């Protein structure tokens, strides 16, 4: 690439914990992202509940695709792979490719509420690595908006978000029959999570927040720290905007066998007395995880994770 | 002392992140601090600010009195630096003997109320090892109280609470004549520290706190992560309850300027709103601190500050 734009991005993840990188992928990747996700969306039935869980069961998820690992690390390797480089040399990390997500909004849609990656990253360890590629399939202008927001770590250092989540969530595991409907306790139990309003958040960052353009071949990179959020697509534009996101981690990410736990059994408590079943797209990453983990690990990484250990070379850089 | 109790104590420790330590000192030492302190507390005049802005300036402190440092490494040592190899072992740590408190409350008075050691530990990086050592100077029993409550860090992890704090300190400092009354502006902001109410920290816990008796001799030990308050003393029995706090530090604890920058900008502000005149008991430990930063830093750590660094050998075991 450039080598003094390449320089800025480092600076900027590095003060921010993110940073937007302009026509990292091009039109044809883009063009084979659309359809293979097209594709392999065609095929299966897919639910709300997984995208709602993972943010705490607090059901302000209003997304149209909420679909985790729709295809496997071999096609995202095929085109991420070889911007490994770029990306452990902006964060002085050694990434692997682990799982993926497909989100998608229509016009006038909340999407995703502000968040950090406590949802996207459970099973691993709050204080290890983890970072995001966000690639827009569908352009993103100052008009019609649709794209996302985003605040630096600077001003909001998420980490400290994954322990309060982590106390909302074994406050969810403590409901009763007693108590009532399942979603109605987690949503007004008097969780600290639960304070933490749109109000709350927006009177902590103010306007420090950033919201810029993609055309396609833009990506948006950050670690597991950053707040964001979707924001809403205005008519007259798209019918219908797509991200594809990749999630990674370092080659030394721990897994967390206890948040792991907890969601299971949040999981489990809520498909139970609601009568759903949660489906899982063989290969999803987290299916694999949790085998290894109900197995026993002989090891902490998730590179020694069988599976992850002999896929592991098209995972990482090349 | 036992060998079997010892074992205990450390045991204990690793699961709640403090442990109340039974007869740890004489009758004749605590005569001792019992009469030093009261020789020191007569001497000075204090107010209730540095307090109040140690906890953020909410203004919820009902205690009597509240002076940090009445008394210097070296007396603190004459009683401390024998215990140190206990603790030490205990923690797994290489403790040094840093500042202390005073603290003391009358009969139906609320102390202080639910916190972590986010302001006692103000002037170091939040990651690095903080304790405290709590030494009733008159008796805590079942039928008056008076004492204190804790909470196990397994039930509440503390740590997250750091940046909650620094959060609400930002916003602190952007106070405004505009804004009206400093301290009214501080307790209504909608900071995610001011929506952690009581009630959510009870939500939070319920009745995952302990509060035990207190025979003069007794102490509690805790890390800066263990959430704790006073509990009120019931009247007949003491006039006033004191407690005697010495803080401790590790041999690796570090300075952290940034959140002693945005101390000193909040006590600045605050004293130059309310026309107040903060008071320091020459060799205050954060005076020699903020000194030392002021005149810039050659190390990080504490044990490199040139006071500390002189007086090393007082402040840390045999």
């Known amino acids: 690439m450039n080598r003094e734009q390449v320089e800025q991005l480092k600076q900027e993840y590095e003060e921010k914990g993110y940073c937007q990188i302009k026509k990292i992928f091009d039109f044809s990747a883009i063009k084979t992202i659309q359809k293979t996700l ?51 040399y902006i964060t002085g990390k050694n990434l692997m490719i682990m799982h993926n997500a497909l989100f998608s909004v229509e016009p006038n849609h909340k999407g995703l509420p502000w968040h950090v990656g406590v949802g996207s990253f459970s099973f691993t360890k709050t204080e290890d690595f983890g970072a995001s590629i966000w690639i827009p399939l569908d352009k993103i202008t100052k008009e019609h908006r649709g794209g996302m927001q985003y605040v630096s770590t600077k001003i909001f250092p ?15 595991i403590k409901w009763d029959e007693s108590q ?3 979603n109605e306790y987690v949503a007004n139990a008097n969780t600290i999570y639960n304070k933490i309003t749109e109000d709350v958040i927006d009177y902590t960052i103010k306007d420090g927040y950033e919201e810029d353009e993609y055309n396609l071949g833009d990506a948006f990179f950050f670690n597991k720290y950053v707040l964001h959020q979707s924001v809403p697509l205005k008519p007259g534009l798209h019918k219908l905007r797509r991200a594809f996101v990749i999630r990674l981690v370092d ?6 066998e206890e948040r792991l736990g907890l969601f299971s059994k949040y999981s489990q408590l809520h498909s139970r007395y609601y009568k759903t079943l949660p489906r899982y797209n063989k290969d999803s990453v987290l299916v694999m995880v949790s085998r290894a983990v109900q197995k026993g ?19 990482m850089a090349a």
Chains 1, 2 share one sequence.
Not at 161 to 167: A, C, G, I, K, T
Not at 251 to 256: A, K
Not at 297 to 311: A, E, G, N
């Open 297 to 315: 690990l002989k090891s902490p990484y998730l590179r020694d994770i069988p599976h992850v250990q002999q896929t592991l070379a098209a995972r």
């Open 38 to 88: 097209d594709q392999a969306k065609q095929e299966s039935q897919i639910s709300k509940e997984k995208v709602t869980l993972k943010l705490g069961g607090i059901d302000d998820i209003d997304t149209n695709d909420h679909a985790y690992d729709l295809v496997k690390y071999d096609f995202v390797s095929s085109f991420i792979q070889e911007k490994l480089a770029l990306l452990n």
């Open 251 to 256: 080659y030394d990410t721990r897994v967390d």
């Open 180 to 182: 009532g409907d399942l």
């Open 158 to 172: 998420g980490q400290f978000y994954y322990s309060v989540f982590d106390l909302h969530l074994k406050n969810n």
